């Protein structure tokens, strides 16, 4: 789906995220929850936050941000050879958490936003292109598994 040049770019940009996984994970979820409040309702653990400050002051939220970006980075490093790591993710988000693919679209966008916000001027046009394509691949692969399950919506 990606060329090696493009994968190269994706892992170059991920090295930025690894320098501060918690801070990046934290802003991704906050971006998600403030931009799309209905997503917050999917989490009994966080439905009590109402304000962004509140969100910002939550250590549990920073904790979950780390789990999420840890699991994505594991998949990205497989450079599309992630059937093994993705299957379990697709199955729990579909049958247990009941996360529509649209919310995966949302978080995907949130990642690109956050990268530009935290690295203004050094998140280039080529890097944005490779990252967008890798997120698309990720999402597309989940979508296939959602279809298999008939997770219709
Ligand atoms: C970048 C895409 C995502 C990744 C890598 C990711 C990763 C994870 C992981 C690894 C877990 C814990 C193990 C599991 O339950 O499978 C989890 C739990 C969960 N995820 Fe995701 N997630 C993503 C997107 C989303 C989105 C978009 C939503 C809702 C808008 C969501 C909702 C949840 C919920 C409700 C849980 C259970 C949390 C708890 O109560 O501890 N996830 N996620």
From Swiss-Prot:
**Top EC class per UniProt?**
oxidoreductase
From the UniProt record, give one GO term of the biological process aspect. Answer: removal of superoxide radicals
Subunit and interaction comment: Monomeric.
Query: What exactly does this protein do?
Result: Monomeric heme protein which primary function is to store oxygen and facilitate its diffusion within muscle tissues. Reversibly binds oxygen through a pentacoordinated heme iron and enables its timely and efficient release as needed during periods of heightened demand. Depending on the oxidative conditions of tissues and cells, and in addition to its ability to bind oxygen, it also has a nitrite reductase activity whereby it regulates the production of bioactive nitric oxide.
**Protein name, as recorded:** Myoglobin
Q: Highest lineage ranks of the organism?
A: Eukaryota, Metazoa, Chordata, Craniata, Vertebrata
Specify which residues bind heme b according to the UniProt entry for this protein: 93
The primary location reported for this protein is cytoplasm
Residues recorded with modification Phosphoserine: 3
Chain sites annotated for binding nitrite: 64
Enumerate the spans annotated as Globin domain: 1-147
The Gene Ontology CC terms held by the record are: sarcoplasm
- Alphabetical list of InterPro entries matching this protein: Globin (IPR000971), Globin-like_sf (IPR009050), Myoglobin (IPR002335)
Enumerate the GO terms in the molecular function aspect. Answer: heme binding; metal ion binding; nitrite reductase activity; oxygen binding; oxygen carrier activity; peroxidase activity
UniProt record similarity statement: Belongs to the globin family.
Compartments where located: Cytoplasm, Sarcoplasm
Residues given in the record as O2 binding sites: 64
